């Protein structure tokens, strides 16, 4: 579905203008979509400074783009209801040179188009282009493509689909709104000659014997073991015992020796392109309550020698002995290495140790809040319609308290999950501005792959506004101070606001595809950040 | 280990000269190494026609290259004993811009260098270069790299290594001479922006529900099932039951219905860049001896419409019900689709059917002769030192008969497999030239991966010669007519020549690694072809 003519190709970075007919929410959503391109490809964007060809993003009727570089500069429309990552990415893929997936030359082998069912003037979105106009880039037809329409697209009648797969199982798959597929990224790479990405700096799952170039020092008293997953209660996070002889983790045993004995595991040297990085990893702590996993940096001392130590974060064990997710903010601007120190506490009171798998390092912020809901498939059967779970309280960089409400069985949309966001009372509220407005909320359900290019995380975005009001609170703004608009909870000693978000955030059937529930548990990320400076 | 300065980079195709001080064997081995680059990368080579920078390949003392593009033209030496794929690939990687892996800036974290062991004048091969000269290309240190030296490299004393890994397990792994590693290909792609490759056209393992864009028509009688491997006593070829819920194959059952019922499985449309292609796949036929698996092409009829049928090959079931390898020559010069017809014969005498997995399509010749040795671990135990196996007799394009001899436990080299080539008598010998004067032999042990970029197949090359002579045949040429120089065999009614080959073709420990013995069986490819046209 890519345009064949090479003169229609861009030169990176693509220069852009955000028009003031976009709201703050759309400007913020566009910049968030640009970060996804940098993370997963070599595509890049710059602010406009008088270039010949450029993209101007505007609010017009509907959501549309031209296809390929129009050398005089060109519109992308992002209308009302289109300020979502997946829709921005689809329009940027039009501008990069891609038609819809149902517009492929071979599409009649894979789908039916019901021309009698398409609304007036939308039928060109269903045209098929010839092999002189469009390339396949030597890739198959992708039902999971972000460029593929959903069955009920521009239909006259809500009961009758416009597009259907010839094999009926794919009617549950076509028109995904998660992210780029693996074939969408492979096409993007083949068109623009990408190999690296601007923002994926490292990842490690420990499956090869060389453990991603990680090394073990001698200043420590002991070593980490590269451990095989071939024992009854010891399986790695990458495969969860799916695959014999094929899933590895690192282990540090704490059941023997002196207390305060330690081992260091240390990365290969890394060259950061930005000033901030997020280190994500998975771990278990089954040993003593006095064991300690400590994350460190070793950085250039300014001579070119990577030897300056800096401690970044400590982790300690509770009664939960399953796999946990960690995020560490690193702030490196010169070459450095990431380090894990496992430490024994009270070996005479330990029957276990420390475990590591699935490390990822990105040149991005870390998520502000992270929530893990355990045994989520059992919760999904034990919870009645409209019964709910609530997250622990999180604090943002500005000091505002917030949380998320999860309704596993939504009353408002049968067979869907409902995620809503609320503000929480917190220790700072007395000095913060109220109502909290112009703050973008990004909620993501994590697709648990260690390589970011494989991930299709579901994400939803809104911005806090004076227009958000409820009859339950005498028609006042939902985002006013939680002690006056919220309701008290013994679970956190909080007042929690009325909760805004999406009934129909994700389908239960979608939640059973990919890695949304990898170890029977659901991981949700939340960011809450001021975008007033984009106005 | 790559050179950082972008002015040292080549423009493709790299112009080359093969100098006439190279023998035929060396010229033929260089052209074979270029095919391996075109198969695994976007690197390309052209004959010289008056360009400014070019590579001239010559026979001088030792085997060496300059590093990066030298803009006035440069030598590669290929000396005596260096006419080997892996050695030629190593020199071409120097010209493309790579130093040895032990020359990385971080190398001291992974290896010990024993300077007092290095023979005089060779020590610069063991130098380490700074991060201003060289890039890591954001890659870990690779023990399995083609650019890494073996332990006994340029050593003064035959018992003492020059280089050792700091972790002793890798002393058995460093200095591999198979092929490019996965990291060496990743470095080459990052340096030159390769995404596609010139010669891999398709591959399919059937692991996704999309089945690599394969389609099933309705002009046939029935369909191929996409089958789950979750049935006892039946699994797929890709994973062989290693991995729960994972491994898929196509299945066509023949145990019910009418005879002559059929199913078509049909590829996506393909645009060949060359005039000849090879379709490799794996299959089983557990049904009736009257079942057929038939390979077809559907090709562009010159209107742009892919509707023209050509039958290419037929396969039928003997008493072996394990996975078999198959190769089909295709000669497509316009867009086409490759097709599998499964056909039922005698469903009242079938308890099984036809199975497909692991399809690969490349713009190459097919191998001239293919040998599968079954139960190879049990053969390797049950065969005494110097006892031998012999292949069926193959025929080349010119009509010469040939075969191979395998000595599973080599007497000459303990812990190695010895593999050798011989000329067989055959139906054409009366009109062929004798002795063989200039035919290159290529022998390959297949690393069984369906994606060619993941293979590290072991290969050896030599050219038949007037200098190959034996005391067993009164100092006459080994390659003279097999009825006058060979011994009669009841196994094929042939005369087989004296064999020539390599004691130490591969170690037993190397053979029990990667995918050389995937289903407890060994696959050997052989090619035997004239290179006199290079003189
Ligand atoms: C020894 O370690 C145990 C926990 O360690 C576990 O048992 C060992 C024998 C080994 O098998 C280890 O591999 C294994 O992980 C400690 O017991 C824990 O003590 C803490 C602190 O008192 C308890 O936390 C409390 O839990 C109560 C509710 O039960 C809360 O009300 C408190 O607020 C607090 O959170 C924890 O529950 C308890 N866990 C268990 C499994 O008993 C033990 O204290 C320690 N002893 C010494 C001498 O260090
Ligand atoms: C019916 O099919 C069998 C083989 O098919 C197998 O058995 C069926 C009942 C089903 O369970 C199938 O799923 C299963 O695959 C035929 O038997 C085979 O016949 C061939 C040809 O005669 C035999 O080959 C010969 O073998 C002898 C030595 O035994 C050699 O000397 C010959 O040169 C030749 O190679 C083969 O051994 C035999 N195999 C078996 C399993 O008995 C059978 O002929 C066929 N009958 C009909 C009605 O077509
Ligand atoms: C991704 O890499 C591709 C190569 O793998 C690039 O494709 C090449 O673009 C070259 C121009 O930049 C082409 O050279 C031109 O070829 C035409 C005939 O097609 C000649 O008339 C021109 O004179 C010639 N120009 C030059 C400067 O030599 C290559 O032919 C072409 N190669 C292939 C295989 O298509 C892509 O441009 C590049 N894409 C991006 C967007 O980076
Ligand atoms: C793969 O694509 C890369 C771009 O994504 C290429 O990297 C670019 O190489 C250019 C040279 O070919 C560089 O231009 C040079 O920049 C230096 C300063 O760094 C200037 O002094 C030079 O004058 C300038 N030369 C030219 C001809 O303009 C680009 O800066 C550089 N870009 C990046 C992002 O690194 C790779 O070369 C390319 N690799 C291959 C061989 O395919
Ligand atoms: C985006 O579309 C707008 C129209 O919605 C384009 O604006 C027009 O520009 C032409 C040529 O200058 C004028 O004749 C029209 O009067 C303009 N219309 C309006 C309503 O402004 C705009 O040029 C497009 N942007 C780009 C750069 O493609
Ligand atoms: C959309 O299509 C449905 C299905 O064809 C229509 O429902 C039918 O309505 C007619 C009367 O107009 C009834 O006689 C049928 O029994 C209905 N069928 C079903 C299955 O409900 C519906 O009227 C159409 N709506 C629109 C917008 O035209
Ligand atoms: C590459 O090899 C050729 C052939 O040996 C070199 O050409 C001559 O080499 C000899 C021995 O070094 C010199 O004495 C001659 O003066 C060389 N003649 C020339 C300049 O053509 C050639 O110098 C070698 N070097 C490269 C990289 O071209
Ligand atoms: C290579 O090194 C080996 C091992 O050091 C040498 O063998 C030793 O030879 C000395 C006499 O020179 C004996 O005293 C030792 O007992 C030998 N040791 C072993 C383990 O055999 C060998 O001589 C060296 N050869 C060369 C080429 O110098
Ligand atoms: O065709 C269009 C329309 C934009 N959009 C297409 C689309 C977007 C993401 C996809 C996808 C298809 O399949 C995979 O993920 C559908 C759409 C969404 C919300 C809307 C709306 C239209 O109208 C206002 O609110 N322009 O390109
Ligand atoms: O360093 C050199 C020397 C060439 N060669 C290096 C080498 C080649 C392939 C490799 C490898 C190392 O590690 C992975 O695979 C070793 C060599 C082989 C045969 C010879 C010989 C030298 O002398 C004559 O016969 N030039 O670059
Ligand atoms: C999940 O269920 C298991 C029992 O199957 C239980 O041991 C574990 O504590 C549960 N986890 C949570 C907190 O849901
Ligand atoms: C391999 O051994 C099996 C028995 O385990 C036997 O059935 C099969 O025929 C053998 N294959 C060959 C030809 O080596
Ligand atoms: Ca792992
Ligand atoms: Ca240590
Ligand atoms: Ca059919
Ligand atoms: Ca398979
Ligand atoms: Zn679109
Ligand atoms: Zn070398």
Whether B89 sits among the annotated catalytic residues: the reply is no
Burial string for A206-238 (b: 16+ CB within 10 Å, else e) reads bbbebbbbbbbeeebebebebbebeeeebbbbb
Residue A465 backbone phi and psi in degrees, to 5: -150, 150
CA of B187 to the centre of ligand 14 (A): 30
Cα R_g (chain B), whole angstroms:
25
Cα R_g (chain A), whole angstroms:
25
Which residues from chain B sit within 8 angstroms of residue A174, using beta carbons?
none
Bridge partners for A309 per DSSP: A298
Tokens matching residue A522: 């659901």
CA separation for the pair A3, A135 (Å, rounded): 6
Contact criterion met (CB < 8 Å) for B213 and A242:
no
Identify which of A136, A212, A243 has the shortest CB distance to residue B242: A243
Which residues from chain A sit within 8 angstroms of residue B140, using beta carbons?
210, 212-213, 268
Integer angstrom CA distances of residue B328 from B325, B365, B394: 10, 10, 16
Atom of ligand 11 nearest to the CA of A374: 14
Closest ligand to the CA of A322? 11
- Residues 6 or more apart whose Cβ sits within 8 Å of residue A59: A19, A21, A22, A23, A26, A77, A78, A79, A80
Active-site residue (options: A51, A89, A91, A261): A91
* Sign of the CA dihedral running A137, A139, A145, A147: positive
CA separation for the pair A6, A305 (Å, rounded): 45
Does residue A11 have its Cβ closer than 6 Å to ligand 3? no
The answer to whether residues B141 and B1 touch, using CB atoms and an 8 Å cutoff, is no
CA separation for the pair A112, B433 (Å, rounded): 61
Length in residues, chain A: 535
CA separation for the pair B2, B191 (Å, rounded): 8
Q: Cα dihedral angle (A138, A143, A148, A150), rounded to 10 degrees? A: 170
CA separation for the pair A129, A3 (Å, rounded): 10
- A533 annotated ligand binder: no
Tokens matching residue B512: 């029990």
Is residue B284 helix, strand or coil? strand
**Which residue reads 């509907």 in tokens?**
A62
- Burial level of A454, CB count in 10 A (0-12/13-18/19+)? middle
The answer to whether residues B214 and B266 touch, using CB atoms and an 8 Å cutoff, is yes
Q: To test ligand 6's pocket by mutation, which of A157, A161, A162 has the most ligand atoms within 8 angstroms of CB?
A: A157
> Considering only CA atoms, which residue is closest to atom 19 of ligand 4?
B6
* Cβ-based contacts under 8 A for chains A and B: 86
Active-site residue (options: B35, B51, B89, B91): B91
Q: Closest by alpha carbon to A154, among A94, A114, A97, A109?
A: A114
What are the residues of chain B with a beta carbon less than 8 Å away from any beta carbon of chain A?
106, 109-110, 130-131, 136, 138-144, 169-170, 173, 186, 189-190, 193-196, 201-202, 209-210, 212-213, 215, 242-246, 268-271, 304, 335
Q: Closest by alpha carbon to A328, among A258, A271, A262, A281?
A: A281
- Helical spans, DSSP H, in A421-506: 482-485
Q: To test ligand 8's pocket by mutation, which of B157, B158, B161 has the most ligand atoms within 8 angstroms of CB?
A: B157
Q: To test ligand 9's pocket by mutation, which of A87, A178, A184 has the most ligand atoms within 8 angstroms of CB?
A: A87
Q: Closest by alpha carbon to B510, among B163, B86, B94?
A: B86
Neighbour tally for B314: CB within 10 Å: 11
Residue B122 backbone phi and psi in degrees, to 5: -100, -5
Atom of ligand 1 nearest to the CA of A254: 13
Identify which of A106, A201, A270 has the shortest CB distance to residue B269: A106
Which residues from chain A sit within 8 angstroms of residue B131, using beta carbons?
304, 335
DSSP string, B347-404: GGG-S-EEEEEEEEEESSPPPSEEEEESSHHHHHHHS-TT--EEPPPEE-TT--EEEE
CA separation for the pair B322, B286 (Å, rounded): 8
DSSP string, B321-361: -S-EEEEEEE--SS-EEEEEEEE---GGG-S-EEEEEEEEE
Please confirm whether the linkage preceding B13 is cis (ω < 30° from 0): yes
Tokens matching residue B169: 């397990």
- Backbone discontinuities in chain A, residue before each (C to N > 2.5 A): none
HEC assignment per residue over B67-118: CCCCCCCEEEECCCCCCCHHHHHHHHHHHHCECCHHHCCCHHHCEEECHHHE
Integer angstrom CA distances of residue B352 from A64, B249, B346, B476: 53, 14, 11, 54
Q: Which residue of B has its CA nearest to A186?
A: B195
CA of A267 to the centre of ligand 4 (A): 29
Neighbour tally for B13: CB within 10 Å: 15
**Closest CA of chain A from B363, distance in Å:** 14
CA of B118 to the centre of ligand 8 (A): 17
Contact criterion met (CB < 8 Å) for B196 and A106:
no
Is residue B454 helix, strand or coil? helix
Task: Kindly list the protein residues that place their beta carbon closer than 5 angstroms to ligand 14, a single-atom ion.
Answer: A 216, 220, 223, 263
Burial string for B508-521 (b: 16+ CB within 10 Å, else e) reads eebbebbbbbbbeb
Q: How many CA atoms lie within 13 A of A445 on its CB side?
A: 26
CA of A133 to the centre of ligand 5 (A): 26
B170 phi-psi bin (left φ>0, alpha ψ -120 to 50, beta other): alpha
Contact criterion met (CB < 8 Å) for A210 and B140:
yes
Which residues from chain B sit within 8 angstroms of residue A138, using beta carbons?
196, 201-202, 270-271
DSSP string, B1-63: -EE--GGGPPPSSEEEEE-TTS-HHHHHHHHHHHHHHHHHSS--EEE-SS-SS-EEEE--SS-
CA separation for the pair A246, A235 (Å, rounded): 10
Contact criterion met (CB < 8 Å) for A269 and B136:
yes
Which residues from chain A sit within 8 angstroms of residue B110, using beta carbons?
215
DSSP conformation class of B305: -
Integer angstrom CA distances of residue B74 from B4, B21, B53, B306: 19, 16, 8, 47
- B100 annotated ligand binder: yes
CA separation for the pair B457, A529 (Å, rounded): 53
Tokens matching residue B164: 């050792």
Integer angstrom CA distances of residue A248 from A210, A239, B269, B400, B493: 12, 9, 40, 50, 53
CA separation for the pair A358, A367 (Å, rounded): 17
Closest ligand to the CA of A160? 6
CA of B204 to the centre of ligand 12 (A): 28
Q: Which residue of B has its CA nearest to A188?
A: B195
Contact criterion met (CB < 8 Å) for B110 and A143:
no
Neighbour tally for A41: CB within 10 Å: 22
Contact criterion met (CB < 8 Å) for A213 and B140:
yes
Long-range contact pairs involving B154-162 (C-beta distance under 8 Å, separation at least 24): B154/B118, B154/B119, B154/B122, B154/B125, B155/B117, B155/B118, B155/B119, B156/B117, B156/B118, B156/B119, B157/B117, B160/B114, B160/B117, B161/B114, B161/B117, B162/B113, B162/B114, B162/B117, B162/B118, B162/B126
The answer to whether residues A72 and A56 touch, using CB atoms and an 8 Å cutoff, is no
Indicate which technique resolved this structure. Answer: cryo-EM
HEC assignment per residue over A437-459: CCEEEEEEECCCCCCHHHCCCEE
- Helical spans, DSSP H, in A45-106: 85-96
Tokens matching residue A137: 């880039």
CA separation for the pair B487, B485 (Å, rounded): 7
Atom of ligand 2 nearest to the CA of B255: 13
- Residues 6 or more apart whose Cβ sits within 8 Å of residue B397: B368, B529
Identify which of A110, A210, A270 has the shortest CB distance to residue B143: A210
CA separation for the pair A78, A64 (Å, rounded): 7
CA of B235 to the centre of ligand 13 (A): 25
CA of B171 to the centre of ligand 8 (A): 22
Is residue A246 helix, strand or coil? coil
CA separation for the pair B198, B178 (Å, rounded): 21
Contact criterion met (CB < 8 Å) for A194 and B195:
yes
Q: How do A55-58 and A74-77 pair as beta strands?
A: parallel
**Closest CA of chain A from B114, distance in Å:** 21
User: Which of B187, B198, B208 should one mutate to test binding to chain A, selecting the residue with the greatest count of A CBs within 10 A?
Assistant: B208
**Which residue reads 């290159």 in tokens?**
B440
Contact criterion met (CB < 8 Å) for B138 and A212:
no
**Closest CA of chain A from B133, distance in Å:** 14
Q: How many CA atoms lie within 13 A of A142 on its CB side?
A: 21
* Sign of the CA dihedral running B59, B61, B66, B72: negative
Bridge partners for B52 per DSSP: none
**Closest CA of chain A from B177, distance in Å:** 19
């Amino acid at each position: 579905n890519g345009l064949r003519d090479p003169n229609t190709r861009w030169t990176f970075p693509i220069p852009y203008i955000l028009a003031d007919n976009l709201g703050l929410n759309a400007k913020g959503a566009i910049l968030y979509a640009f970060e996804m391109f940098r993370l997963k490809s070599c595509v890049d964007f710059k602010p406009y400074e008088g270039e010949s060809s450029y993209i101007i993003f505007q609010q017009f009727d509907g959501c549309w783009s031209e296809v390929g570089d129009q050398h005089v500069g060109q519109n992308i429309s992002i209308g009302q209801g289109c300020a979502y990552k997946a829709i921005i990415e689809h329009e940027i893929l039009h501008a990069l040179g891609f038609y819809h997936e149902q517009s492929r030359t071979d599409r009649d082998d894979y789908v039916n188009i019901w021309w009698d069912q398409i609304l007036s003037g939308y039928q060109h979105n269903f045209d098929t282009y010839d092999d002189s106009l469009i390339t396949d880039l030597n890739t198959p037809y992708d039902y999971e493509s972000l460029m593929h329409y959903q069955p009920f697209s521009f239909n006259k009648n809500a009961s009758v689909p416009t597009i259907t797969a010839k094999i009926p199982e794919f009617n549950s798959i076509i028109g995904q709104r998660l992210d780029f597929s693996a074939i969408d990224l492979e096409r993007l790479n083949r068109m623009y000659n990408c190999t690296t990405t601007h923002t994926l700096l490292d990842h490690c799952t420990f499956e090869k014997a060389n453990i991603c170039g990680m090394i073990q020092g001698t200043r420590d008293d002991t070593d980490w073991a590269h451990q095989d997953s071939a024992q009854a209660g010891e399986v790695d996070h990458t495969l969860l015992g799916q695959c014999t002889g094929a899933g590895y983790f690192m282990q540090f045993s704490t059941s023997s020796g002196s207390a305060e004995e330690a081992a260091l595991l240390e990365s290969r040297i890394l060259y950061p392109k930005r000033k901030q990085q997020c280190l994500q990893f998975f771990y278990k702590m089954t040993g003593s309550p006095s064991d300690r996993l400590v994350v460190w940096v070793r950085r250039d001392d300014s001579t070119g020698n990577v030897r300056k130590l800096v401690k970044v974060q400590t982790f300690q064990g509770d009664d939960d002995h399953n796999w946990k997710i960690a995020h560490v903010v690193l702030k490196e601007e010169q070459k450095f290495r990431y380090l894990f120190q496992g430490t024994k506490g009270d070996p005479q009171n330990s029957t276990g140790g420390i475990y590591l798998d699935d490390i990822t390092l990105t040149e991005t912020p870390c998520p502000t809040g992270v929530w893990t809901v355990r045994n989520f498939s059992q919760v999904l059967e034990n919870t009645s319609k409209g019964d709910k779970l609530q997250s622990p309280r999180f604090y943002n960089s500005e000091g505002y308290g917030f949380g998320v409400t999860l309704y596993p069985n939504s009353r408002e949309s049968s067979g869907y999950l409902r995620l809503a966001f609320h503000v929480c009372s917190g220790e700072n509220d007395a000095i913060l501005e109220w109502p909290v407005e112009n703050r973008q909320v990004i909620i993501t359900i994590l697709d648990q792959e260690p390589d970011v290019r494989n991930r299709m995380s579901s994400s939803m975005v809104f911005t806090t506004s004076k227009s958000h009001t409820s009859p339950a609170i005498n028609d006042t703004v939902i985002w006013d101070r939680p002690s006056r608009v919220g309701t008290y909870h013994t679970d956190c000693n909080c007042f929690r606001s009325i909760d805004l978000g999406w009934s129909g955030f994700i389908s239960h059937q979608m939640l059973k595809r990919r890695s949304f529930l990898k170890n029977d548990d659901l991981i949700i990320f939340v960011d809450f950040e001021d975008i007033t400076h984009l106005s």
